[PDB]
Amino acid sequence: TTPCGPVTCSGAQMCEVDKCVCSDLHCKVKCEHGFKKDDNGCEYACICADAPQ
């Protein structure tokens, strides 16, 4: 989450100069259902999803 260029990165998005992208950056835990995804489709770095997608 961060203001970025002409746009604004939400939740799990990392700001790339002028655009907000998702990252493959993750802690190495074992989420039963995988990493939690924001409304934009990105997965949060180190937060697990509470139910299968």
Binding site: H26, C27, C31
Partner: protein
């Protein structure tokens, strides 16, 4: 452990599995009653399984102990993953011996180039999930703070160090968090984070345990 070998028998006695209904992290046994791990592995009411071989079948050594106090480092930043270190106190003291044995804390940090042993039951596949039943081991050197910082610009703190192969193919992976990184019989680092697994130019990042030896020692003496 992406691209590793089965440790077999029992050569990683200090290894432990953190369970919360299922395996979700690893950790190292510092001594009978304490277990060091990745602060991000913190969970309410963790159960430690020691002397594990297969994390599904009772391979002789089977010890499920509840954790009394799960003390997370007071500066761990859930965002930067800086100070990713946590101490676990077992409700009951673990049975030291030839099977389950403690790993030693370091007195001085490992110089880049040092060959270490990373171990865990985490995913083996780079692309796709293949979680092994048996403990996997991986020999890997400590990369230079420079190649580290270059791989993960600025993100690499003084409490972090890169280990693995810049080429890729061999690296720790999801399910390996909190596991040990032993170099010359000492606990040098804790499996922390990285980009994907075994990805080229994205080495595994680990917690510099040497910077936390004092804290570890004080925490144990007071709790």
């Amino acid at each position: 452990i992406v691209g590793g070998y089965t440790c077999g028998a029992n050569t990683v006695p200090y290894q432990v599995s953190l369970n919360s209904g299922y395996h979700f992290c690893g950790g190292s046994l510092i001594n009978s009653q304490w277990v060091v791990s990745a602060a991000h592995c913190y969970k309410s009411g963790i159960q430690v399984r020691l002397g594990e071989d297969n994390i599904n079948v009772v391979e002789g050594n089977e010890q499920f102990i509840s954790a009394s106090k799960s003390i997370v480092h007071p500066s761990y930043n859930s965002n930067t993953l800086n100070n990713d270190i946590m101490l676990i106190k077992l409700k009951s003291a673990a049975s030291l011996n030839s099977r389950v044995a403690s790993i030693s804390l370091p007195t001085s940090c490992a110089s880049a180039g040092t060959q270490c042993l990373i171990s865990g039951w985490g995913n083996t596949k780079s692309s796709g999930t293949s979680y092994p039943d048996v403990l996997k081991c991986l020999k890997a050197p400590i990369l230079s703070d420079s190649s580290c910082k270059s791989a993960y610009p600025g993100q690499i703190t003084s409490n972090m160090f890169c280990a693995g192969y810049l080429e890729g193919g061999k690296d720790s992976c999801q399910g390996d968090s909190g596991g040990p990184v032993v170099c010359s019989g000492k606990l040098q680092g804790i499996v922390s984070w990285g980009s994907g697994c075994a990805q080229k130019n994205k080495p595994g990042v680990y917690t510099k345990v040497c910077n936390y030896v004092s804290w570890i020692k004080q925490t144990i003496a007071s709790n």
